[PDB]
Amino acid sequence: REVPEYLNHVSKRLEEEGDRVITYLDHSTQKPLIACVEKQLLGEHLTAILQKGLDHLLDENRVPDLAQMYQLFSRVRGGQQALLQHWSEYIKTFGTAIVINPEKDKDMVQDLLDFKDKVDHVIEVCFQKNERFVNLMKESFETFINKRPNKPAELIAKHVDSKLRAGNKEATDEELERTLDKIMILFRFIHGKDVFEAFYKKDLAKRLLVGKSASVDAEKSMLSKLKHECGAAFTSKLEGMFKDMELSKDIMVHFKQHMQNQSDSGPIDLTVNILTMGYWPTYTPMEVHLTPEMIKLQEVFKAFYLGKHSGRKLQWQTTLGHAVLKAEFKEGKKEFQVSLFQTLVLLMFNEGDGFSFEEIKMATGIEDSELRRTLQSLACGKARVLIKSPKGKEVEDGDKFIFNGEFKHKLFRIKINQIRQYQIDAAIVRIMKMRKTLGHNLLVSELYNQLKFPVKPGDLKKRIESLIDRDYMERDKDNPNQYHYVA
Amino acid sequence: ALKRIHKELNDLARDPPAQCSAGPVGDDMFHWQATIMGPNDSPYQGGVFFLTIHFPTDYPFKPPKVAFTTRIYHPNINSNGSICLDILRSQWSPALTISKVLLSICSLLCDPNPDDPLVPEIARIYKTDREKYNRIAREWTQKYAM
Amino acid sequence: KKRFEVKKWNAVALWAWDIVVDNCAICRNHIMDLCIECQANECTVAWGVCNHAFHFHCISRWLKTRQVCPLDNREWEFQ
Amino acid sequence: MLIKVKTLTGKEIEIDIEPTDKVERIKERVEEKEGIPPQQQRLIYSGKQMNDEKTAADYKILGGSVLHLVLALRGG
Amino acid sequence: MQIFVKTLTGKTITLEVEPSDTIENVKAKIQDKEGIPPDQQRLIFAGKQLEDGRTLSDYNIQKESTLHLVLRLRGG
Ligand SMILES: [Zn+2]
Ligand SMILES: [Zn+2]
Ligand SMILES: [Zn+2]
C-alpha cells in the first residue's frame, strides 16, 4: 500500500484496538496493547514511511493525510522528531530549487511568497500550529534564501517596487498592505539586508522623482515597517528623501512668488526639487548646451535659494529633469513629457527636418552612449517621433533622423522617457574545560570540526600562547604537547 | 539640559562606541549607568566594570559625576569607586560627550599616573614593581569583573 | 518651418554645504538649525580664532563659565 | 526586529528576534551566526547586563538596537 | 589605505595613512583636518593611548578600522 492509504489503515487499526479494549479486554491492558501495535505499525517504519510518502505528500499539499501523519507520528516515541527532519530537509531541498537557478529570476519572489504561504498553511491546519515546527520553518527559510548572495534581496526589492508602482492599480489599498506584511516576514530572513536598502533606495529614488508611486500612504506604510523592523538607523536615509519632497513644495511657494513680483517671467513654467545630497543616490553631473532662455532660469533660482540659505550650493541634475514640448503636427497638437536630453535633442528637429547623429551631438554635448539611448527613444519607440535612415532598432553614427510630421497617436499628452581571533580563543577554553587534559594534536583537530572557517597554524599557536599568558591553559611540566585545564 | 542628553542618547544608540555602553537606568534621564569592558592586552582583559553616571542640571557646561560601581584596582580610582580625572573635575569641556568620557576612562585603565595618585598605597606598588601590579589587578578583575 | 521653442520644464537639484556642517560641539545641532535652547519658542554662529564654530547662545554661556575654547585650548575671539 | 550584536573587535553581527523572545533566544541566535554557545556570552545592552530569564520587551529593545557581546571564557 | 577617526564634534573623518606612518604625523593630519594642536589629541584604539613615538603597524591597525579622538587628560 502507498503511504496515504497506509496511514488510513493505521488510523483504522488503532481505533479497532481502542474499540476492543472498551468491549471486552481489561482496561489495564489499554496502554501496552496500543503501544505494542503502534510500535510495530509505525515505530519500526518511521524513516521508511517518511521517505516514501512525506516528500511526495507535501508537494501535493494533501491536507488530510499530513494531519493524519502528524497525529499518528506523535504517538511513537521520537516519531515527531523524525517528522521534523524529513519535513525540514524538504524545505532546504525544494527551497533551494526556487533560488539556486538564475533562470528563474523573473519568477523568484512570488514562488518564495507562495511557497512561504503554503508551508505556513500546513502549520496552521495540519500540524496544529506546533511551535517547534514554526521555529524550524523560520530557521530553514533563513538558510536556503541565503544560498544565493545578494540576489534575493535585489528581487524582493524589485518586487516591492512593482507592487507600489502606479501601474499597480489592480491591488486595492487593503490588499496591498497584506502583501507587504508577507514580504516583511520574508525580508526578515535575508542576511545581506544592507544590499536591500541600496536596491530599494535606488528604486524609491526613481519613484519620487517621476511621481509614479501608486499610493503615498502605501509608501509611508512601507517605511513604517522597515523602521520598526530595522530601526531608524537603517531607514534614516530613506526618510530624508520624503522630507526633501515635502520641503521642495514649500520652496516652490516662495520661489513662485518671487517670479510673479518680477515683470520678466518666462513662458516656461518651472518646478525644481531640492534634495539633500547625502541621502539620494549618487549622480554624476554631466554638462548640456542649454539654451539662453534655459540657462537663465537656474540662475535666478540658484541665487534666490542661496540668498535664502547661505553656505549651500545647488549643483543641478539635468539627467533627472523632464519638460513638456507641445508640438504642431499635421493632425493636431501633441505634448511630450521628455527628459532634458530628449528636450534638447527634440529641440534640434524643427529648423531642419533631420540632422546627423554627430550634428546633434556637438549641439547638445550628451555622452554618446546615452545620446544613442535618447535617440532610440525618439526613433525606435512606439511614439516614433523620428524616422531613422537606415531604419532599424539600433542607432548608428551615420543616422540622419527625420522628424515625424506625420506623427499619429491616440492620447493628446504622450511620454517617451521609457528609454575569528576570539572565536578561536573561546572554543579552546570551552573544549579544554570539558576535557580537563588534552594534547596539542587533538585540540588542533577538534577546532576545525568546531570552527566553520579556516584556521592558520600560526594563528592557532598564537592564541594558545596568549591563553597561556592569561592563565587559561597550562602546559605539562614535562610534555609541552599536553595541556591541562587550570580552573 | 535634557536636549543635550537626548541627542547624546540617540547618537549613542545609533553609532555606539566599540567597548562602551551607557543608557538611562530608569525614567530619570539624568542618571545613566555605563559599562567599560576592560581594554584588550591589559590585566583587565575580559572584564566588565559598571560605572554610574550622574548628570548635573547644567550638564553641557558642568561635568558628570561618574563613579565606578565594580571595585576596580587602580592607583587613580579609590576603593569607593570614585575617579579623579582632570578632564572630569577641572578641565571639563562641553565638546566632550559621554561616549568620549567613557572611552577616555577606558584608555586610562591602562595608563595610570602614580604621581599624584588617589590611592598612594597602590601607587607605590605600581611605581616600584609592575609585575605584581599585573597580578593583583588580574585577580581583582577575575573576582569582580567576570 | 523653423521652431525651436520650449513650453514647460521640471528639474531637480542637489544642495550641498559650502564647506561642512560645522557641527556645534556644545549643543550638537546643525549650524543652520537654531541653538538647542533657541529651538524652544535669531541664533547666530560665532567663530573662534581657531575657526571653530559655535552658536553664540552656547559659547557665550561656556565663556561665562570658562574663557577657553572647548575643542582647542586657545582663547575665544571672533574675526 | 533586528538587533545587531557588535562585539569588542567591532564586527557587527546581525540578529533577528520577535519582540517577546527571551534573551536565551537572543544568545542562541548569536550562537548560530557567530558560533559562541550561550553559556559563554554576557550580553550588555546600554549598560545593563541582560539576565537570562527576562523577555526582550523588558529592556525596550527596538529595531537596530545595538547590544554588546563580551566573552566569559569560563562560562560554567 | 585609509582609516576612520571619530573627531570630538560628532563628525567622522577618514584619514589616508600607511602602516609605516608614525603617530605624530597622524596627529598632524588631525590638526590640518580640523585643527586641535598635536599636544591636545589623545587617540584611543581599544582603550589604549596611541603613543606619539610609534606607528599604526605597532598597534595592529588595519583597513576600515576606527580611532577615537578625545581631549588630553591626566591621572589623579
Ligand atoms: Zn542659541
Ligand atoms: Zn577653537
Ligand atoms: Zn551650539
Residue numbers in the entry:
A (entry chain e): 254 to 672, 692 to 759
B (entry chain D): 2 to 147
C (entry chain R): 19 to 59, 67 to 104
D (entry chain N), E (entry chain U): 1 to 76
Paper text:
During transcription-coupled DNA repair (TCR), RNA polymerase II (Pol II) transitions from a transcriptionally active state to an arrested state that allows for removal of DNA lesions.
Still, we observed dissociated CNRL4CSA–E2–Ub subcomplexes, which could be processed to an overall resolution of 3.5 Å. Although, at medium resolution, ranging from 4 Å to 8 Å, clear secondary structure features in densities for all polypeptides could be used to unambiguously dock the CNRL4CSA–E2–Ub and UVSSA structures and create a model that we superimposed onto Pol II–TCR–ELOF1. Comparing CRL4CSA and CNRL4CSA reveals major conformational changes in the ligase induced by neddylation and binding to E2–Ub. Upon neddylation and loading with E2–Ub, the beta-propeller B of DDB1 turns 40° in a clockwise direction in relation to the rest of CSA–DDB1, which breaks the interface between CUL4A and DDB1 and allows the E2 to engage helix 7 of the VHS domain of UVSSA that also moves slightly toward the ligase. As a result, the position of the activated Ub shifts approximately 30 Å closer to the unstructured Pol II loop carrying K1268, which halves the distance compared to the non-neddylated ligase.
